[PDB]
Every structure is written in structure tokens, then in C-alpha cells.
């Protein structure tokens, strides 16, 4: 209404410069948010290719337990995973020996630790309690009885 000349062109230069810095700022910060969101999306594609398509043995990546399965679901703009974990908890107390000195020779069990020397009875798994009757398949010939800490006889 009240403008005349290059005066107003100076004023509109001020307006354009301010709005142009604001828009440039918007573009730059949305680009930074895009970088973070695509890093997260790469993690998400990695978890869908890993956790959902197979059992990913890496720990505290997919779930918080031991990651038995995974079920994806969509979202507004996102994705929501449902990690089917596996949490073991009823702790016990049983003694052990790292070896079996049957007849002067070492019997280490299976790579697959804890010889159950709970009164020298079995050899089990690591996580789930499962006693198995000890046989020659459950261990192997290993040297002599030099580094055996716990003597266990009657290897059947």
C-alpha cells in the first residue's frame, strides 16, 4: 500500500533473506533428521533380515532373552518388532568337577560344560537342566590324570 521505490526493494531483500535463511535451516535440519532416520532404518532392515528371517545368535541385539522367534508388525511411519525371547529362571545349587579321573586318565565331557558332580551322577547341558547318563560317547580319552581336579570313578 505505502511502498514507493528501491527502498521497498531493500525491505523485501531483508524479508527474502530472512525467509531464505529460515528455509535453508529447515532443509539442513530435515537432512540431518533424514540421516538419523535412515541409520535407524538400516538397523531396522538388519533386524528384519536377521531376527525375523532366522535365529540370530548375537546377544542383546534382537530381544533381551535368547531370541527364539520374531514377529514384525507395521506402524504409522515405523515398524514394531515382537521379539519372542527365552528367559530361564529357577536357579539351583549343584557341585561340579571339571573332569573325570576314571582309571588315571582325563575325561573332559563334550564342549558343553558342567559335568554333574552332584554326588557324581551325570553330565548335563548348560542352560536347561537335563541329566544324561554318562557313557563313553559323552566324553573322550584325554591324556593322564595330571590336571584332574575332581576324581570321579565308575565311568560306565
Amino acid at each position: 500500500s505505502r511502498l514507493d521505490k528501491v527502498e521497498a526493494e531493500v525491505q523485501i531483500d531483508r524479508l527474502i533473506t530472512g525467509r531464505l535463511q529460515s528455509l535453508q535451516t529447515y532443509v539442513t535440519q530435515q537432512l540431518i533428521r533424514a540421516a538419523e532416520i535412515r541409520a535407524s532404518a538400516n538397523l531396522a532392515a538388519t533386524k528384519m533380515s536377521e531376527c525375523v528371517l532366522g535365529q540370530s545368535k548375537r546377544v542383546d541385539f534382537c530381544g533381551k532373552g535368547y531370541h527364539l522367534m520374531s514377529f514384525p508388525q507395521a506402524a504409522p511411519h515405523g515398524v514394531v518388532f515382537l521379539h519372542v525371547t527365552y528367559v530361564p529362571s529357577q536357579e539351583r545349587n549343584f557341585t561340579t568337577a571339571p573332569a573325570i579321573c576314571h582309571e588315571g586318565k582325563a575325561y573332559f565331557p563334550r564342549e558343553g560344560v558342567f559335568v554333574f558332580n552332584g554326588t557324581s551322577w551325570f553330565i548335563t547341558q548348560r542352560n536347561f537342566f537335563s541329566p544324561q547318563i554318562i557313557t563313553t560317547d559323552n566324553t573322550f580319552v584325554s591324556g593322564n590324570c595330571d590336571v584332574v581336579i575332581g576324581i570321579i570313578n565308575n565311568t560306565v
Binding site: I37, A41, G63, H77, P88, Q90, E91, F94, T95
Partner: protein, 420 residues
Amino acid sequence: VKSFEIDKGIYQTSNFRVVPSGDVVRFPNITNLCPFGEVFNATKFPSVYAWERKKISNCVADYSVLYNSTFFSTFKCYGVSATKLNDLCFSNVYADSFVVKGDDVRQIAPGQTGVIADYNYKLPDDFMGCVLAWNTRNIDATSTGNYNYKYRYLRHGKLRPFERDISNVPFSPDGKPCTPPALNCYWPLNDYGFYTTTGIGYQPYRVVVLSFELLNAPATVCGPKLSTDLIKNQCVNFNFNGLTGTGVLTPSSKRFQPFQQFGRDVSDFTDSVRDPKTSEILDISPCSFGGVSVITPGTNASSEVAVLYQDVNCTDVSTAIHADQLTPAWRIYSTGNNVFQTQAGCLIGAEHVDTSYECDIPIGAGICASYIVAYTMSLGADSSIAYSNNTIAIPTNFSISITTEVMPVSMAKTSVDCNM
């Protein structure tokens, strides 16, 4: 945050700062009247090739005789402003007096050489004060002729600023000590031709240049101001000889020098000054400031807040509240207690509790609030384990625990019509 329902959490908000209370001016005790009435109302005035530089020091200027008078034809200041001129005790001001025609006002500037300001009186390009000229057609200009004033127009090269040539050298463009009137061997001197009834452009002007040597000494030429006394450890305003500001004063720890006056500690940050009445005081110009932040439990289990100030020590805060000095000045506002450690500042409205919780709300350094209490932190469920021999735990019954997890893969696909 533009809402009514507001959930639980520290929410950053506006800035707090202590309003200064007092008003402290410290000038020298020098009292005199300036020779302005001497120099401006004088008889003898030199020409341009012999312009005279007079020192004025140990005075009290007024700077209203410069304004409350229509004696002045052209009065333009360059480095300073007009009305705010007596707010700075200058250091050893210099009056440069000469007499020009009724044309040469356009020359005397930083740059804009012309002839006579290129040949007879050169200015620097920053260090300027105020330039004044007035018409004196009714004192010395006889229509018969005032042939007593001269200038020089023949110099081998231009001038460096504030430099004066007097010697009548027999100017010849190839060295050549000549005998004028030989050819190309003249005198550089030339008259004016000041007449009474002539045009305005041929009328005599008197020109006074006021160069202001800004504050390279303990200042002497002050203005008509009144000094007060030091108010230590309390946020006040400043006006020293040439410096203003707003801060908190305190005695120093310096090995200061007799010629030095300022402190400019790291990068133009003053921080220590030398008082004009025999002292040396540091300057914490950061009185106190920062940003407040509200702690709220969430407007659905409580309605009582707790204000966290950030960079304070809870000693200026109590005084500034109970003397109404904070810029987020409230109306409904009280203080039951004042929690302060973990140096993130004043935690108004909280209770120290040794029984620490799972760190609901993140206050500063370790300390976390709740509910309103503000404990330090329980980092986790504390325990110890029996670390004896062969006995070994094995889980026998398990569970399955489907857990969610959220991954964002796509922000808002936006676009801008950047012509609208």
C-alpha cells in the same frame, strides 16, 4: 508448551537474570572549565598550511555550548553521536584550527581528497571526533581584500594523515632548486581573495577539528556527571571514564601496570578495571543468569511444581527472590526450602531423601526427583553373590517373554513450493 495436560518431566523454559540494583559512576575528581570559549571565540586563527593543534586536558567539558547555539554553520560528528557525547571522559582531546573558503567543507572527511584536504590537511580514516565550521564573513573579509591568508597547492605527492608542510620550497617538478619566476619553478603559496559582498562560496569559514584520542591514558576531560561509591558483591550498573556495563564488583589479585587501565581478559571481556580514585577491582559482569526449568509430576497426580535454576549457588537466588530482582517475576510464589548441591543449581521446592529410587527425572548430576522428593540415585538393585567353589546354579523352569521394540523407518515425506 501450549497445552493444558502436561506430562511428567523437566521442561526447559525462559531465561532468568538478576536485575541490577544500584548505579555506580566513578570518574576522576578533576574539576575545571574548558578553553572552548577561548578557542572558539578567539582572534588569531591560522591558515590551512599552518593549522594549529592545541591540547585540552584536565577539564570538565559541557557539550551543550556546542548545541544550544546557532553560531555554528556546519557541525558534523564522525565517530561519535551528537547528544550522547558527554557520556565519555575522553583522553587529551586535540583541537585543530584553521581557516578555509566557503567551499572546502565538502573536502574535510575520511577520504574525499579534493585539492586542499589532499595538499594541506589530511585526516585518517577511522580516528575522528567532530568537525565544525562557521561563517566569519563579518570579521576579516574586507571587500577590498583579505590577502593575509594562504594555502599551498604544489606538493611532490600527497599527505600522510595529520602532517603539516610550512617551508616555502621553490617548487619544481624535477627537484631543481630554482629562482622563481623561472619556468615551472613557482611558489606553492597562493592567496584566498576573501571579499565581503561576494558569493557565499567565497566567504571565510573557520574550521575546528576535534580529534578524540580515545582512552589511551587515565582520562582527564570528563563531562558534567556525578560520581557515587563502590557497592561490592552486588549487581549494579557502570559508568567509568569511557566504559559502561552491568556487573558485580570485587577487589582484585593483580600485578597491574601503572599505564594500563583495562583488563580485556581473554577476548574483549573486560573483567578487571582500574578505578579513577586509586583502586583496582575485578568485574564479574555475569551477575547471574541462565534458564529456569519446571519439574512437574504430570498434572494428573499433582499440580505442584519445582523450579530448577541452572548456573547459580542458591545465595543470590534467595536475595533476588526476597527483594524482587528476578526477570521471571511471579505473583504467586514462595520458598519452603532450598536444596543445593550437584552443581546444576537451585532446586526450589524439594527434599533431600537418602532412600533413593529408580531415577524418574534427570536433575543435573546424579540427583533425581520423584512423585516432592529429590534423592540422589539408586543405580540399581544392589546385591552380592556367593562366589564359593564347585556349587553351580542351573535354571530348571523357564519362561517366554515377548517384548516389543520400536524402529522408525520413514519420516514425513515433505516438499516446499519455494516460490510460495
